[PDB]
mmCIF file of C-alpha atoms in Angstrom:
data_model
loop_
_atom_site.group_PDB
_atom_site.id
_atom_site.type_symbol
_atom_site.label_atom_id
_atom_site.label_comp_id
_atom_site.label_asym_id
_atom_site.label_seq_id
_atom_site.Cartn_x
_atom_site.Cartn_y
_atom_site.Cartn_z
ATOM 1 C CA UNK A 1 91.020 98.734 104.037
ATOM 2 C CA UNK A 2 89.771 97.848 100.606
ATOM 3 C CA UNK A 3 91.774 94.720 100.650
ATOM 4 C CA UNK A 4 89.737 93.472 103.675
ATOM 5 C CA UNK A 5 86.286 94.540 102.152
ATOM 6 C CA UNK A 6 86.993 92.927 98.897
ATOM 7 C CA UNK A 7 88.070 89.752 100.676
ATOM 8 C CA UNK A 8 84.919 89.861 102.884
ATOM 9 C CA UNK A 9 82.625 90.265 99.774
ATOM 10 C CA UNK A 10 84.278 87.379 98.050
ATOM 11 C CA UNK A 11 83.732 85.159 101.221
ATOM 12 C CA UNK A 12 80.229 85.925 101.903
ATOM 13 C CA UNK A 13 79.079 86.138 97.968
ATOM 14 C CA UNK A 14 81.640 83.757 96.480
ATOM 15 C CA UNK A 15 81.662 86.405 93.572
ATOM 16 C CA UNK A 16 84.873 88.483 92.170
ATOM 17 C CA UNK A 17 84.108 91.689 94.433
ATOM 18 C CA UNK A 18 85.576 94.535 91.909
ATOM 19 C CA UNK A 19 83.768 92.692 88.765
ATOM 20 C CA UNK A 20 80.234 92.315 90.666
ATOM 21 C CA UNK A 21 80.307 95.599 92.700
ATOM 22 C CA UNK A 22 82.992 97.867 91.508
ATOM 23 C CA UNK A 23 80.662 99.747 89.482
ATOM 24 C CA UNK A 24 77.219 98.512 90.343
ATOM 25 C CA UNK A 25 74.246 100.755 90.634
ATOM 26 C CA UNK A 26 74.407 104.072 92.035
ATOM 27 C CA UNK A 27 75.884 103.286 95.347
ATOM 28 C CA UNK A 28 78.321 100.156 94.938
ATOM 29 C CA UNK A 29 81.948 100.768 94.224
ATOM 30 C CA UNK A 30 83.462 103.982 92.868
ATOM 31 C CA UNK A 31 81.966 107.360 93.368
ATOM 32 C CA UNK A 32 79.573 108.431 96.065
ATOM 33 C CA UNK A 33 75.870 107.678 96.684
ATOM 34 C CA UNK A 34 72.764 108.023 94.833
ATOM 35 C CA UNK A 35 69.318 106.793 94.787
ATOM 36 C CA UNK A 36 69.588 102.997 95.069
ATOM 37 C CA UNK A 37 68.734 100.771 91.864
ATOM 38 C CA UNK A 38 67.779 97.904 93.617
ATOM 39 C CA UNK A 39 68.380 95.956 97.216
ATOM 40 C CA UNK A 40 71.991 95.112 96.160
ATOM 41 C CA UNK A 41 72.709 98.961 95.591
ATOM 42 C CA UNK A 42 70.902 99.541 98.866
ATOM 43 C CA UNK A 43 73.306 97.451 100.800
ATOM 44 C CA UNK A 44 75.959 99.591 99.357
ATOM 45 C CA UNK A 45 74.255 102.743 100.284
ATOM 46 C CA UNK A 46 73.915 101.736 103.859
ATOM 47 C CA UNK A 47 77.629 100.788 103.686
ATOM 48 C CA UNK A 48 78.621 104.503 102.356
ATOM 49 C CA UNK A 49 76.814 106.075 105.100
ATOM 50 C CA UNK A 50 78.382 103.608 107.760
ATOM 51 C CA UNK A 51 81.870 105.010 106.554
ATOM 52 C CA UNK A 52 80.691 108.541 107.065
ATOM 53 C CA UNK A 53 80.015 108.122 110.806
ATOM 54 C CA UNK A 54 83.466 106.742 111.150
ATOM 55 C CA UNK A 55 86.312 108.763 112.914
ATOM 56 C CA UNK A 56 90.024 107.899 113.834
ATOM 57 C CA UNK A 57 90.774 105.831 110.830
ATOM 58 C CA UNK A 58 90.617 105.785 107.067
ATOM 59 C CA UNK A 59 88.187 103.224 105.795
ATOM 60 C CA UNK A 60 89.932 102.896 102.233
ATOM 61 C CA UNK A 61 93.484 102.615 103.482
ATOM 62 C CA UNK A 62 93.647 101.361 106.973
ATOM 63 C CA UNK A 63 93.950 97.437 107.514
ATOM 64 C CA UNK A 64 92.404 95.759 110.135
ATOM 65 C CA UNK A 65 92.377 92.233 111.579
ATOM 66 C CA UNK A 66 89.521 89.710 111.323
ATOM 67 C CA UNK A 67 88.976 86.034 111.200
ATOM 68 C CA UNK A 68 87.143 83.329 109.454
ATOM 69 C CA UNK A 69 85.535 81.093 111.999
ATOM 70 C CA UNK A 70 82.981 78.509 111.448
ATOM 71 C CA UNK A 71 82.489 80.188 108.301
ATOM 72 C CA UNK A 72 81.816 83.361 109.955
ATOM 73 C CA UNK A 73 83.531 86.749 109.508
ATOM 74 C CA UNK A 74 84.620 87.540 113.031
ATOM 75 C CA UNK A 75 86.057 91.232 113.674
ATOM 76 C CA UNK A 76 89.056 91.078 115.716
ATOM 77 C CA UNK A 77 89.047 93.618 118.848
ATOM 78 C CA UNK A 78 91.423 96.261 117.059
ATOM 79 C CA UNK A 79 90.592 99.753 118.195
ATOM 80 C CA UNK A 80 87.260 101.935 118.341
ATOM 81 C CA UNK A 81 87.429 103.099 114.860
ATOM 82 C CA UNK A 82 89.002 99.828 113.157
ATOM 83 C CA UNK A 83 86.364 97.461 114.765
ATOM 84 C CA UNK A 84 83.456 99.787 113.772
ATOM 85 C CA UNK A 85 85.211 99.787 110.179
ATOM 86 C CA UNK A 86 85.441 95.949 110.293
ATOM 87 C CA UNK A 87 81.806 95.599 111.303
ATOM 88 C CA UNK A 88 80.720 98.253 108.301
ATOM 89 C CA UNK A 89 82.366 95.827 105.948
ATOM 90 C CA UNK A 90 80.938 92.683 107.347
ATOM 91 C CA UNK A 91 77.410 93.915 107.197
ATOM 92 C CA UNK A 92 77.855 94.954 103.482
ATOM 93 C CA UNK A 93 79.447 91.628 102.633
ATOM 94 C CA UNK A 94 76.267 89.880 104.307
ATOM 95 C CA UNK A 95 73.923 91.958 102.708
ATOM 96 C CA UNK A 96 75.363 91.420 99.255
ATOM 97 C CA UNK A 97 75.007 87.599 99.651
ATOM 98 C CA UNK A 98 71.517 87.894 101.061
ATOM 99 C CA UNK A 99 70.591 89.900 97.817
ATOM 100 C CA UNK A 100 72.328 87.967 95.184
ATOM 101 C CA UNK A 101 68.898 86.512 94.758
ATOM 102 C CA UNK A 102 68.012 89.752 92.605
ATOM 103 C CA UNK A 103 71.352 91.008 91.553
ATOM 104 C CA UNK A 104 70.966 92.165 88.018
ATOM 105 C CA UNK A 105 73.796 92.579 85.658
ATOM 106 C CA UNK A 106 72.189 95.584 83.935
ATOM 107 C CA UNK A 107 73.396 97.519 86.637
ATOM 108 C CA UNK A 108 76.768 96.007 86.837
ATOM 109 C CA UNK A 109 78.749 98.680 84.871
ATOM 110 C CA UNK A 110 76.872 101.767 85.531
ATOM 111 C CA UNK A 111 79.166 104.293 84.019
ATOM 112 C CA UNK A 112 76.255 107.017 84.602
ATOM 113 C CA UNK A 113 76.955 107.140 88.224
ATOM 114 C CA UNK A 114 77.636 110.638 88.310
ATOM 115 C CA UNK A 115 74.359 111.434 87.040
ATOM 116 C CA UNK A 116 72.343 109.285 89.405
ATOM 117 C CA UNK A 117 69.378 111.024 91.133
ATOM 118 C CA UNK A 118 70.753 112.454 94.568
ATOM 119 C CA UNK A 119 70.841 110.670 97.533
ATOM 120 C CA UNK A 120 68.971 111.317 100.660
ATOM 121 C CA UNK A 121 71.093 112.406 103.671
ATOM 122 C CA UNK A 122 72.644 109.695 105.865
ATOM 123 C CA UNK B 1 87.426 113.026 87.435
ATOM 124 C CA UNK B 2 87.211 109.251 87.016
ATOM 125 C CA UNK B 3 84.370 109.598 84.785
ATOM 126 C CA UNK B 4 86.426 111.440 82.165
ATOM 127 C CA UNK B 5 89.366 109.018 82.974
ATOM 128 C CA UNK B 6 87.124 106.037 82.494
ATOM 129 C CA UNK B 7 85.590 107.668 79.268
ATOM 130 C CA UNK B 8 89.084 108.127 77.588
ATOM 131 C CA UNK B 9 90.189 104.884 78.444
ATOM 132 C CA UNK B 10 87.039 103.494 76.411
ATOM 133 C CA UNK B 11 87.784 105.873 73.441
ATOM 134 C CA UNK B 12 91.565 104.889 73.172
ATOM 135 C CA UNK B 13 91.189 101.065 74.112
ATOM 136 C CA UNK B 14 87.845 100.070 73.054
ATOM 137 C CA UNK B 15 87.709 98.175 76.353
ATOM 138 C CA UNK B 16 85.265 98.320 79.546
ATOM 139 C CA UNK B 17 87.866 100.381 81.409
ATOM 140 C CA UNK B 18 86.654 99.448 84.955
ATOM 141 C CA UNK B 19 86.640 96.007 84.021
ATOM 142 C CA UNK B 20 90.142 95.728 82.205
ATOM 143 C CA UNK B 21 92.131 98.243 84.365
ATOM 144 C CA UNK B 22 90.178 98.765 87.621
ATOM 145 C CA UNK B 23 92.546 96.180 89.417
ATOM 146 C CA UNK B 24 95.153 95.563 86.791
ATOM 147 C CA UNK B 25 98.925 95.011 87.930
ATOM 148 C CA UNK B 26 100.249 96.735 91.045
ATOM 149 C CA UNK B 27 99.677 100.273 89.556
ATOM 150 C CA UNK B 28 96.243 100.482 87.680
ATOM 151 C CA UNK B 29 92.965 101.532 89.471
ATOM 152 C CA UNK B 30 92.677 101.261 93.157
ATOM 153 C CA UNK B 31 95.466 101.672 95.458
ATOM 154 C CA UNK B 32 98.736 103.244 95.050
ATOM 155 C CA UNK B 33 101.842 102.668 93.030
ATOM 156 C CA UNK B 34 104.268 99.382 93.239
ATOM 157 C CA UNK B 35 107.021 97.652 90.960
ATOM 158 C CA UNK B 36 105.064 97.421 87.719
ATOM 159 C CA UNK B 37 104.122 93.870 86.221
ATOM 160 C CA UNK B 38 104.338 95.085 82.517
ATOM 161 C CA UNK B 39 104.127 97.980 80.185
ATOM 162 C CA UNK B 40 100.267 98.383 80.690
ATOM 163 C CA UNK B 41 100.884 98.621 84.519
ATOM 164 C CA UNK B 42 103.810 101.150 83.984
ATOM 165 C CA UNK B 43 101.219 103.260 82.104
ATOM 166 C CA UNK B 44 99.435 103.430 85.277
ATOM 167 C CA UNK B 45 102.369 103.963 87.239
ATOM 168 C CA UNK B 46 103.517 107.079 85.266
ATOM 169 C CA UNK B 47 99.774 108.165 85.441
ATOM 170 C CA UNK B 48 99.872 108.137 89.335
ATOM 171 C CA UNK B 49 103.367 109.936 89.283
ATOM 172 C CA UNK B 50 101.495 112.532 87.079
ATOM 173 C CA UNK B 51 99.023 113.167 89.497
ATOM 174 C CA UNK B 52 101.523 114.104 92.187
ATOM 175 C CA UNK B 53 102.462 117.218 90.374
ATOM 176 C CA UNK B 54 98.998 118.547 90.500
ATOM 177 C CA UNK B 55 98.012 121.531 92.831
ATOM 178 C CA UNK B 56 94.741 123.010 93.344
ATOM 179 C CA UNK B 57 92.287 120.289 91.967
ATOM 180 C CA UNK B 58 91.034 116.976 92.924
ATOM 181 C CA UNK B 59 91.866 114.059 90.400
ATOM 182 C CA UNK B 60 89.205 111.561 91.640
ATOM 183 C CA UNK B 61 86.400 113.984 91.858
ATOM 184 C CA UNK B 62 86.933 117.240 89.677
ATOM 185 C CA UNK B 63 85.338 117.292 86.355
ATOM 186 C CA UNK B 64 87.157 118.873 83.454
ATOM 187 C CA UNK B 65 85.882 119.282 79.736
ATOM 188 C CA UNK B 66 87.754 117.756 76.710
ATOM 189 C CA UNK B 67 86.279 116.714 73.313
ATOM 190 C CA UNK B 68 86.832 114.164 70.577
ATOM 191 C CA UNK B 69 88.265 115.674 67.525
ATOM 192 C CA UNK B 70 89.422 113.599 64.563
ATOM 193 C CA UNK B 71 89.455 110.749 66.932
ATOM 194 C CA UNK B 72 91.847 112.397 69.276
ATOM 195 C CA UNK B 73 91.328 113.428 73.003
ATOM 196 C CA UNK B 74 91.571 117.001 72.906
ATOM 197 C CA UNK B 75 91.737 118.729 76.372
ATOM 198 C CA UNK B 76 89.522 121.828 76.437
ATOM 199 C CA UNK B 77 89.542 125.227 78.405
ATOM 200 C CA UNK B 78 90.000 124.431 81.931
ATOM 201 C CA UNK B 79 92.325 126.169 84.643
ATOM 202 C CA UNK B 80 96.159 125.418 84.903
ATOM 203 C CA UNK B 81 95.535 122.508 87.339
ATOM 204 C CA UNK B 82 92.475 120.891 85.341
ATOM 205 C CA UNK B 83 94.329 121.332 81.979
ATOM 206 C CA UNK B 84 97.174 119.129 83.604
ATOM 207 C CA UNK B 85 94.753 116.555 84.879
ATOM 208 C CA UNK B 86 93.140 116.417 81.658
ATOM 209 C CA UNK B 87 96.604 115.675 79.995
ATOM 210 C CA UNK B 88 97.610 113.080 82.847
ATOM 211 C CA UNK B 89 94.033 111.293 81.822
ATOM 212 C CA UNK B 90 94.732 111.565 78.069
ATOM 213 C CA UNK B 91 98.252 110.408 78.490
ATOM 214 C CA UNK B 92 97.513 107.278 80.183
ATOM 215 C CA UNK B 93 94.488 106.452 78.079
ATOM 216 C CA UNK B 94 96.855 106.502 74.778
ATOM 217 C CA UNK B 95 99.611 104.458 76.784
ATOM 218 C CA UNK B 96 97.040 101.770 77.903
ATOM 219 C CA UNK B 97 96.060 101.616 74.088
ATOM 220 C CA UNK B 98 99.683 101.626 72.927
ATOM 221 C CA UNK B 99 100.083 98.664 74.993
ATOM 222 C CA UNK B 100 97.220 96.550 74.251
ATOM 223 C CA UNK B 101 99.641 94.031 72.487
ATOM 224 C CA UNK B 102 100.931 92.659 75.793
ATOM 225 C CA UNK B 103 97.728 93.182 77.939
ATOM 226 C CA UNK B 104 97.661 90.025 80.231
ATOM 227 C CA UNK B 105 94.319 88.918 81.804
ATOM 228 C CA UNK B 106 96.353 87.240 84.743
ATOM 229 C CA UNK B 107 97.189 90.569 86.007
ATOM 230 C CA UNK B 108 93.650 92.087 85.349
ATOM 231 C CA UNK B 109 92.531 91.221 88.990
ATOM 232 C CA UNK B 110 95.258 91.571 91.173
ATOM 233 C CA UNK B 111 93.940 91.415 94.980
ATOM 234 C CA UNK B 112 97.622 91.172 95.763
ATOM 235 C CA UNK B 113 98.117 94.863 95.271
ATOM 236 C CA UNK B 114 98.720 95.618 98.864
ATOM 237 C CA UNK B 115 101.640 93.280 98.800
ATOM 238 C CA UNK B 116 103.410 94.492 95.778
ATOM 239 C CA UNK B 117 106.936 95.548 95.983
ATOM 240 C CA UNK B 118 107.273 99.231 97.059
ATOM 241 C CA UNK B 119 107.324 101.888 94.053
ATOM 242 C CA UNK B 120 110.598 103.571 93.523
ATOM 243 C CA UNK B 121 110.023 107.402 94.013
ATOM 244 C CA UNK B 122 108.719 109.249 90.662
#
């Protein structure tokens, strides 16, 4: 669920997740997908495409189990959808951390999201 | 849609809407309803109750038209459902404005939202 997703992003990036990524670019946070602004935005693009493939559980609402072991996100066994979901969320949290070096505040609050250029099919 | 809602909140409160209300309390922004933390939170509680009356349109994704007349939100044209939706969004924007005097930053990023006490029926 959003809680786990938000938590993972905090753990990996050290950043307030909603503040840094809630309305970032054309792909991070609220809304759908669009042509990526930068590498951070591309992380979120991939993440939303990941959510699209999921069947059997609800990515926004469904809780899943994971642990913090040797400062690594370790997805619990869960079930097929929940584990795929956990891995979707882990991957984007990792991606966002790896692109903190080009994170740009000028994209942080993009209220022009509805008018982003259309994204390519996943 | 979220865009119109965000814009109304900006117009009434003068605040960055996602920043101030995206994760506030147990009712504002993401997630469902919960026992309200304060008057601001109760504004969002009422808003989400208002949404349940809607039949025919999608509050997160469906666009509607409104205008800014004599510094007032004026819901335009719109079918029966979109009219109601617009009026729901207008009501919460006004309410948030009216309760700026007790807005509390400590509730602003409430990542304990999944653990809010259960909301009473609307």
